Amino acid sequence: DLSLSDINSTVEVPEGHSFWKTLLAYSGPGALVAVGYMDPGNWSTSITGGQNFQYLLLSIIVISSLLAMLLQNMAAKLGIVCQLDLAQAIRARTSRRLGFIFWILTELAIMATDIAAVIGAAIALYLLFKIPIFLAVVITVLDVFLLLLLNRIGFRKIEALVVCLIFVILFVFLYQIILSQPAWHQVAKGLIPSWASVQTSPKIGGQTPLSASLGIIGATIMPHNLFLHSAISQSRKIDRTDSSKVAEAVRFSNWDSNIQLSLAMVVNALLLIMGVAVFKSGAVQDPSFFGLYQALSNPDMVSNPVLAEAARSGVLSTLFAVALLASGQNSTITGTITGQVIMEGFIHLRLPLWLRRLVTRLIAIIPVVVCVAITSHQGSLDEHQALNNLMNNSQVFLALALPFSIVPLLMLTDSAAQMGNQFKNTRWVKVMGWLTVIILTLLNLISISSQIAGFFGDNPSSQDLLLSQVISIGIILAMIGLLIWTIIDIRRFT
């Protein structure tokens, strides 16, 4: 009847005031959540953002990360204080049909992240081991056994394995930046919140600063990682009777989560400066993983003789594919964990990790093998580009399930009927939290129309455009109705 019954309140090791060892104990949840924010689903969009705007957008990344650190912390709080995840709180404070709508929506979000992971991992196999594109996907379907071995390890070593992947993809891209020797002064200048990133005038590669910046801000949080954080934050036993020990617990999970999401921010920065310093100006014409592979394997695309020699040897591209692999392994862990959370929390369905990863991976790979089938039927022509367009089109479910995850979190954590007058949110995080939630909801409701129109490709059929407008209006209005309904129920609880 409690979230993550297998590993809930497992190891509690606060030992008086020995703070840093205590920090070493529970440092896992923050890594498990942060590794999701390094998925390849936006890698290109950083590199692109670097080529179109050298170091300019870095500040935006920071801000985004900060906002992601905010809401995530709140989620952790809801897990730490209430001893229950966000899905159990929402489902407890609303009917079953809204919990089922939220269930299918979040399932579609983690399914989209799973599609990005299977595309990136399969392409990673196509690049490293030269496995055929169709075979690499059905090889990625075999991650259920990697989940079976994953199950017997334990969170003290699983949550450190996630750290291992994090520093794999972090050192892979940091190594190619160390070789680049970039002008770190311009990097520091870019990290400052300047007003050139809010303008609309450069328009390089069909992208203005305000467009790229608002895109980075819009994709700030992932809805499934909120439930994930609220569930894994409970894995440390807390008495819930000593205010100093629960306040300490909040400081604990906060410092952990910021320590890891900071690493994710560092990875995004390494991708932007990867697009600025490593690649030449405008050298990246194919945002696909294969386009970045050959672009990292062509000496004329880099801006340094050392990177030309190393690129001719073929080490940059292979490291890139390895980072693709290490990023593609995350959805096997966090996808099954979060999927269990929303499943047994929203619809009260107890399912094993076997059929979970089976169903999720299959539903994820169906459109992938359809895409590879059609493109390989056209002669394997534009197959990687179409895989990239599938990966980007999948990200609409995140915008569909984002408000129903950030609004109920902020409401339930701001109310004293769920946190109490002692552990509710400060008047500071009330303003910052509501501002961030409003901005993200607005930006995502804006993104709905752009992505739905993007489903029809770069060929604007005049008759299909009006249909895209009708469907977009219907979707955003339906999300408005669901949003005001959830607002009404939660505010009836408070």
Numbering used by the authors: 13 to 506
Authors' account:
mutants of Glu129 and reduced to half in H236A. different role in proton-coupled metal ion transport. does not function as primary H+-acceptor. the pKa of Glu129 would have to be shifted upwards. in vicinity to the metal ion coordinating Asp51.
conserved and function as secondary active transporters. transport proteins that include the amino acid transporter LeuT18.
